[PDB]
Amino acid sequence: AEREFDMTIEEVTIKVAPGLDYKVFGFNGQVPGPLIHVQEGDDVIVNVTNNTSLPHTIHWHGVHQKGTWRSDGVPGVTQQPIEAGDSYTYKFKADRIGTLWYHCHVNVNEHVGVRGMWGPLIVDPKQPLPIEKRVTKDVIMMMSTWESAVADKYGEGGTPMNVADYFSVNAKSFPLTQPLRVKKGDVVKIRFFGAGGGIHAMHSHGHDMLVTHKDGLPLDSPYYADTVLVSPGERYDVIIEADNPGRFIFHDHVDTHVTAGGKHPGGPITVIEYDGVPVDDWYVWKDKDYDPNFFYSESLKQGYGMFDHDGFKGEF
């Protein structure tokens, strides 16, 4: 089917951690960018308007661009950039399945590295794996890093000379992340993305993960892991069988990454919380203002197209 939608690029500010507001170039004014969910073989048309002061493009990472290389989104290679105020249309066929993503391809060290110019592109295969048919919850986790020194300074950052001192999943640093709420017998698909410039060793307490896909393609030899290393550009899909009720933290195991501005704890941390486990008064998230769509799990259930999420929106 043909799926057409409209995306903008906006100058907004998001809160990454307590105390750290960050100027970003958000697709539809949000970080992560909107979810795009389509079916294998769909024809996609994306109309992009740059409402920022700098040039950008959008590259569709994982999308082959078969016979459509001029929609690959690479400035000086496949197109001239989308200047401030201008618009550009991408057209491609979603013939490559799985967990893909999209991001700016201008000034990538800064724009992708610290300005939030990325989001998920999920292509459902015609022939999912049998285990994918058992999935009851689909979870997107996009990891990235932040350089507090350039939080207010578009046009700066993302170099070797900078210091990445904050770390996140879906643009929040613990405790501003959200729990992964499950119930016993859930079958949870988690998609990890190396969205920013860091490496993330994603470890699930209480559970092993079955690694089923690399860069959205199914492995002939899936393997179990309790820690999955995710580097820039990569995706890994896993399955967790939610058969062990408790509260089980789930986090980046790289030691410096569970800090925030040199303070601990922080960083890419969530908690697998099972329904019905009694809550101790000392539980760090006992009073959480819960967002069930923090990992796009609700959006993923609502059809094919483009989805914004108000909890990812920044301020103008």
The answer on whether 253 is annotated among ligand-binding residues is: yes
The answer on whether 309 is annotated among ligand-binding residues is: no
The answer on whether 264 is annotated among ligand-binding residues is: no
9 C-beta neighbours (distance < 10 Å), count: 25
Residue nearest to Cl ion (CB): 276
Residue 281 CB, nearest approach to a copy of itself (Å): 9
Residue 239 CB, nearest approach to Cl ion (Å): 18
Nearer to a copy of itself, 276 or 303 (CB): 276
Outline where the chain has alpha helix (H).
Answer: 108-111, 130-134
The answer on whether 56 is annotated among ligand-binding residues is: yes
Query: Which of 191, 235, 238 minimizes the C-alpha distance to 211?
Result: 238
Partners of 45 in beta bridges:
4, 91
Are 194 and 144 in contact, with CB atoms under 8 Å apart?
A: no
- Pick the binder of a copy of itself from 53, 89, 136, 227 (CB under 8 A): 227
User: Which phi and psi angles does 71 have, rounded to 5°?
Assistant: -105, 10
- Pick the binder of a copy of itself from 50, 52, 107, 177 (CB under 8 A): 107
Q: Please report whether residue 18 would count as binding a copy of itself according to CB under 8 A.
A: no
Residue 219 CB, nearest approach to a copy of itself (Å): 6
Nearer to a copy of itself, 102 or 307 (CB): 102
Distance CA 252, CA 180 (A): 15
Distance CA 162, CA 10 (A): 24
Residues that bind Cl ion (CB under 5 A): 183-184, 245, 274-276
What, of Cl ion, a copy of itself, Cu ion, none, does residue 56 touch, CB below 5 to 8 Å by kind?
A: Cu ion
The answer on whether 200 is annotated among ligand-binding residues is: no
What, of Cu ion, Cl ion, a copy of itself, none, does residue 104 touch, CB below 5 to 8 Å by kind?
A: Cu ion
Q: Which two tokens stand for residue 316?
A: 């103008």
Residue 101 CB, nearest approach to Cu ion (Å): 7
Distance CA 235, CA 260 (A): 24
Parallel/antiparallel/unpaired status of strands 2-17 and 43-51: parallel
The answer on whether 203 is annotated among ligand-binding residues is: yes
Q: How many helices (H) and strands (E) does the chain have?
A: 2, 20
- Pick the binder of a copy of itself from 126, 221, 303, 310 (CB under 8 A): 221
Q: Buried (b) or exposed (e) across 157-191, using 16+ Cβ within 10 A?
A: bbeeebebbbbbbbbbbbebbbbbbbeeebbbbbb
Q: 263-292: which residues touch a copy of itself (CB under 8 A)?
A: 264, 271, 277, 282-284
The answer on whether 251 is annotated among ligand-binding residues is: yes
Nearer to a copy of itself, 170 or 204 (CB): 204
From residue 51 to residue 90, the character string flagging contacts with a copy of itself as x (rule: CB under 8 A) and all else as - is --------x-xx-xxxx-xx-x-x-xxx-x----------
Nearer to a copy of itself, 260 or 309 (CB): 260
Size of the site for a copy of itself (CB under 8 A): 77
Burial of 90 (0-12, 13-18, 19+ CB in 10 A): buried
C-alpha pair distances (Å), 1 with each of 19, 44, 109, 295: 45, 8, 35, 26
Q: Which residues are annotated as a binding site for Cu(2+)?
A: 56, 59, 61, 103-105, 111, 117, 203, 205, 251, 253
- Which residues are documented as binding site? 56, 59, 61, 103-105, 111, 117, 203, 205, 251, 253
